[PDB]
Amino acid sequence: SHGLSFSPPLSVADGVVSLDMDPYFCSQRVSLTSYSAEAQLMQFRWMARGTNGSSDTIDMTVNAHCHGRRTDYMMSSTGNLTVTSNVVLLTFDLSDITSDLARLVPSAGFQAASFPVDVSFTRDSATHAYQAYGVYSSSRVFTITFPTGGDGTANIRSLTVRTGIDT
Amino acid sequence: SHGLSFSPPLSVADGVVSLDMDPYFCSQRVSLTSYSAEAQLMQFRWMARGTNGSSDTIDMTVNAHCHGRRTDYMMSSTGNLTVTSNVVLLTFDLSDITSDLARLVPSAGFQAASFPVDVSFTRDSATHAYQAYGVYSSSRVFTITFPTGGDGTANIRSLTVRTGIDT
Amino acid sequence: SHGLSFSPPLSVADGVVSLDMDPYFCSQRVSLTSYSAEAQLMQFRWMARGTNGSSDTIDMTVNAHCHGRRTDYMMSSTGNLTVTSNVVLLTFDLSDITSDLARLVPSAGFQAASFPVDVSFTRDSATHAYQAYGVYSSSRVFTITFPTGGDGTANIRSLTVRTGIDT
Numbered sequence: 001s002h003g004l005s006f007s008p009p010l011s012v013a014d015g016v017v018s019l020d021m022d023p024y025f026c027s028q029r030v031s032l033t034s035y036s037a038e039a040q041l042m043q044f045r046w047m048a049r050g051t052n053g054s055s056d057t058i059d060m061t062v063n064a065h066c067h068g069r070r071t072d073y074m075m076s077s078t079g080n081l082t083v084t085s086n087v088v089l090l091t092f093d094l095s096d097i098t099s100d101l102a103r104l105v106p107s108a109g110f111q112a113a114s115f116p117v118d119v120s121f122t123r124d125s126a127t128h129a130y131q132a133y134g135v136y137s138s139s140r141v142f143t144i145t146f147p148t149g150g151d152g153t154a155n156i157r158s159l160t161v162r163t164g165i166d167t
Numbered sequence: 168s169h170g171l172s173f174s175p176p177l178s179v180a181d182g183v184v185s186l187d188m189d190p191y192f193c194s195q196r197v198s199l200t201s202y203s204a205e206a207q208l209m210q211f212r213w214m215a216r217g218t219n220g221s222s223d224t225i226d227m228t229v230n231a232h233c234h235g236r237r238t239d240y241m242m243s244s245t246g247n248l249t250v251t252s253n254v255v256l257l258t259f260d261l262s263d264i265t266s267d268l269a270r271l272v273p274s275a276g277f278q279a280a281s282f283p284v285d286v287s288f289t290r291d292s293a294t295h296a297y298q299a300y301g302v303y304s305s306s307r308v309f310t311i312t313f314p315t316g317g318d319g320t321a322n323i324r325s326l327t328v329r330t331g332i333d334t
Numbered sequence: 335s336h337g338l339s340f341s342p343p344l345s346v347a348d349g350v351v352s353l354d355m356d357p358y359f360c361s362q363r364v365s366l367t368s369y370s371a372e373a374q375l376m377q378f379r380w381m382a383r384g385t386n387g388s389s390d391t392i393d394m395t396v397n398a399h400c401h402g403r404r405t406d407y408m409m410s411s412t413g414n415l416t417v418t419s420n421v422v423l424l425t426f427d428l429s430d431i432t433s434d435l436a437r438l439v440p441s442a443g444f445q446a447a448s449f450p451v452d453v454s455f456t457r458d459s460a461t462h463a464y465q466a467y468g469v470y471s472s473s474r475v476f477t478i479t480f481p482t483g484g485d486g487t488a489n490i491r492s493l494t495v496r497t498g499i500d501t
Binding site: 015034037074 | 336337339341342343344353355359403441450467
């Protein structure tokens, strides 16, 4: 009475059965292979906000390499960040950028965990480098946490952030 | 007489044909896209064993970021490692850890080759950094090889290992 | 009159319907999972050519870790590179290598953008490190651009290039 059907990502049109493919994730060249969508390298300014250990903000020059469903951030501060404590929480919210924002949004899978972030900066003429960690707290906002290299009030500069997300 | 059938990863149930999907590798949102499984960041201690150029062992504080089927290791020694030669082979066996061990096991594809490992440590107050290489020698055990920065007996400290595996 | 058919990467043979799979990209273990093809670590010499800011060339010792459809380059110069300007364009053409060249060729998706490249070198005894960028200009040729750390004629040495491509 009832025959045979196909559930997504399989679909049918005029009795032709197909694989629906996310071009950012895969594609066919006779077989199923990796993504066919253009990579892009976006460059923009992102104003990060201290949210604990600081109420200052900081301009970061960002390069985002969106390639397949991997997106890698390479960022640089301009100007200084005022820090109050010895650890600082620094927040990146998509609003504060100045564009398919899509491929700057982590998949729900990725958001489940804290992720590695490479951080360095200068504090009164000494360089500091730390293995730090980021966490998304909503799909549009993540926060990195790293030590500031001392106590009480100071101004760090030449802040670099290297990280990546699965979108 | 004989009709039409479907081979894995295609399967059928009540005449509904499906793509069986590894959630750590892909998933559907109408189309075939990347993984839907939660990422996790595990933190644990791994005791590495010198196996040549040393018979000492060394506590490493490990963070493993298991995200999709990529797993990235960021590790730090505590205490010192006694080295005898000028290259050392350092072994990471899953037993020596203190948990889905699954996503700390490389795919058979990955094991076929030696893989890049970032290493640095301090030796009598000088820092040393090397591009080193790891090789799995069984699915549960890999060995990194790196130079020790001198000869005969010494103690290196602040050992860091940054690497990653395809699981 | 006309029934039902299957378009690639779906195919059929003796009324058995299949997923055609790129083994460098995926495979089945009951479900669709990631690649099954061996990783390999190739080691060879690549002669890069200055193409602007220099007409010199430079031997690089290359290690390429081809794993799945990701290929990561770790390279080192031997000898010195003569630089004339304050930025230099350095070109890597597959001809100049001395082997499935296949997995050293970026997918068309990847070529669409400039990509991040890590570079450092020494210039009259000071170390220099820069976040640089590469661009393929044909599927067999890419060019990195980085600053040389000064002006007019000099010789840089101990040049390292760390980058990666989606193949």
